[PDB]
Amino acid sequence: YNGFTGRKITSQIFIGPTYYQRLKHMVDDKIHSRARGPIQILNRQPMEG
DNA sequence: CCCAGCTCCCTGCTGGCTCCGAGTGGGTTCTGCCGCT
Numbered sequence: 001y002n003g004f005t006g007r008k009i010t011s012q013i014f015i016g017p018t019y020y021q022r023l024k025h026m027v028d029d030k031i032h033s034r035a036r037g038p039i040q041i042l043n044r045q046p047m048e049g
Numbered sequence: 050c051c052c053a054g055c056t057c058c059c060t061g062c063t064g065g066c067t068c069c070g071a072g073t074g075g076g077t078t079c080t081g082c083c084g085c086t
Contacts, residue, residue, distance in 0.1 A: 030074070049074085 001008055038047050 025074085032073095 034046065039045060040047055
């Protein structure tokens with residue numbers, strides 16, 4: 001049944017228990033932005049990483 | 050008035066040099082030291 005309206009879904013749905021894994025890759029360890037931060041000594045371009 | 054060097058040019062081979070996808074996240078170790086001057 002659709003949760004929003006309570007109506008049945010016309011097609012029947014394949015459902016059951018499946019072993020799932022949480023991988024170490026999490027968005028909060030990847031998100032990054034920069035607006036004029038530190039720069040390299042030799043060339044004066046933004047730092048890496 | 051032919052021939053053997055001699056020169057000059059073209060081929061073919063071998064050796065030498067440069068290049069080898071785009072981003073991104075972590076980790077670790079290493080950046081000298083010893084004999085005797």
